[PDB]
Amino acid sequence: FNCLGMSNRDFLEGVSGATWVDLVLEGDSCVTIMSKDKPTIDVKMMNMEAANLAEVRSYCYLATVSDLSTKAACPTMGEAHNDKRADPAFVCRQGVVDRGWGNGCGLFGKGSIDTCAKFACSTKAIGRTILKENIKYEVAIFVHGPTTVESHGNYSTQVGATQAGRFSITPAAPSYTLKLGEYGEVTVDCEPRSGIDTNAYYVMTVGTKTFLVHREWFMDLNLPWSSAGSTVWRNRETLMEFEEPHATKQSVIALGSQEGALHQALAGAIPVEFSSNTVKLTSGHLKCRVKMEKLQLKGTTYGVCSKAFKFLGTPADTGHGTVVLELQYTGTDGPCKVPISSVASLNDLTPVGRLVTVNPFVSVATANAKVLIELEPPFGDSYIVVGRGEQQINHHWHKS
Numbered sequence: 001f002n003c004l005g006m007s008n009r010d011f012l013e014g015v016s017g018a019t020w021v022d023l024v025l026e027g028d029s030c031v032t033i034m035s036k037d038k039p040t041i042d043v044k045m046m047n048m049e050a051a052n053l054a055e056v057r058s059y060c061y062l063a064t065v066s067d068l069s070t071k072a073a074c075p076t077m078g079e080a081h082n083d084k085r086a087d088p089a090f091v092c093r094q095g096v097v098d099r100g101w102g103n104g105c106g107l108f109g110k111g112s113i114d115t116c117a118k119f120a121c122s123t124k125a126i127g128r129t130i131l132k133e134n135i136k137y138e139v140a141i142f143v144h145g146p147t148t149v150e151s152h153g154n155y156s157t158q159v160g161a162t163q164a165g166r167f168s169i170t171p172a173a174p175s176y177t178l179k180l181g182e183y184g185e186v187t188v189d190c191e192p193r194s195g196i197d198t199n200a201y202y203v204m205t206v207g208t209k210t211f212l213v214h215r216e217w218f219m220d221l222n223l224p225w226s227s228a229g230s231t232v233w234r235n236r237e238t239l240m241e242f243e244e245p246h247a248t249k250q251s252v253i254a255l256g257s258q259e260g261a262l263h264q265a266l267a268g269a270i271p272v273e274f275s276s277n278t279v280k281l282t283s284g285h286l287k288c289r290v291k292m293e294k295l296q297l298k299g300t301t302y303g304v305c306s307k308a309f310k311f312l313g314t315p316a317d318t319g320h321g322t323v324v325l326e327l328q329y330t331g332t333d334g335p336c337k338v339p340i341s342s343v344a345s346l347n348d349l350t351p352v353g354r355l356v357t358v359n360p361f362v363s364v365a366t367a368n369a370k371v372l373i374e375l376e377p378p379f380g381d382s383y384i385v386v387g388r389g390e391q392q393i394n395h396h397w398h399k400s
């Protein structure tokens with residue numbers, strides 16, 4: 001929900017004197033944004049899903065091909081009408097059988113025949129739609145306020161500290177104004193627009209493995225089917241019945257169910273994880289405008305920390321041209337600003353390393369508190385320093 005530690009991170013400084021910034025978020029990526037005299041924040045897209053879906057069709061693979069019927073009609077006696085023709089209880093089909101004396105009929109020749117088999121469904125290869133209106137985005141915003149190696153990744157702690165949030169964006173309401181306590185608030189206006197595949201594709205569901213198929217390959221396929229009712233049409237797939245029998249019994253062999261027909265057209269349609277009501281879309285992006293003239297600093301009326309500061313370990317390389325590290329404050333005094341900067345050479349007057357964790361400070365008054373810090377040092381060798389004079393400590397670093 002925040003950027004630290006992610007490989008898909010991008011640092012931004014909107015514009016000069018800008019209270020807003022235009023941005024682009026995508027799947028597994030994050031973005032850290034900096035702005036003069038204001039907290040740093042991380043905008044990050046968490047999830048992409050198609051919610052509130054609706055079914056469209058339902059092809060079956062089937063069972064019930066058990067009950068039989070064979071309404072017999074003697075030659076010249078006309079056609080045969082099976083009572084099992086009043087209700088879709090069964091599927092009927094007429095035929096004719098060569099007969100006569102040999103089998104109870106008076107004349108010789110073709111006699112009518114109208115048998116019927118039953119139909120209900122077993123495994124429904126269900127499928128649904130994705131209204132562009134069903135697309136909802138989940139953006140998470142973090143605030144680079146006080147943290148520790150520990151609490152930095154705990155969403156809970158952070159929310160509690162009002163230094164994080166997770167809201168959703170929809171075509172309905174593409175914006176939001178996330179309030180962050182005394183830090184004011186950030187208001188994004190993400191524009192659902194994105195470079196992705198049009199809703200044109202259907203939502204194919206097969207047993208467990210969900211897939212995304214082409215409207216037509218799907219709709220224009222050959223298998224029994226049913227929209228939103230218990231009523232099924234084209235059940236003709238109850239085939240291979242017409243052994244072209246006798247009036248006694250017309251073998252109604254249940255058509256062998258060969259999942260190959262489906263499977264075979266696997267690769268074509270893209271696979272997708274789908275929970276009863278959700279469809280996580282993987283490909284997609286979002287253009288946002290992080291307006292933040294309402295984002296504001298905090299603890300700016302406090303004094304500078306004046307007590308020893310100790311490193312808790314070799315700073316680490318984020319792989320982004322910045323490093324992380326955690327301090328510990330011997331200080332007994334309360335919430336004070338942390339005097340840390342990046343100096344080009346011991347005891348220089350002017351800094352050179354910009355802090356990602358701008359305006360850092362010991363959150364509590366409980367001595368020996370920890371402070372996490374991410375900063376970008378200059379290239380080549382440099383020194384990180386905390387405190388000043390004879391309290392001041394330091395640790396060297398060399399960027400490449």
Ligand SMILES: *[C@H]1O[C@H](CO[C@H]2O[C@@H](C)[C@@H](O)[C@@H](O)[C@@H]2O)[C@@H](O[C@H]2O[C@H](CO)[C@@H](O)[C@H](O)[C@H]2NC(C)=O)[C@H](O)[C@H]1NC(C)=O
Pocket residue numbers: 153154155156157
């Ligand atoms: C963040 O959320 C929970 C907060 O507990 C922490 O609170 C801070 C202020 C500090 O005092 C920490 O020392 C303390 O642990 C914790 O998460 C809880 O739920 C997790 C569920 O997987 C579980 O792993 C964890 O043990 C449990 N801790 C508690 C409240 O007893 C945890 O600190 C951290 N959550 C995680 C694990 O990321």
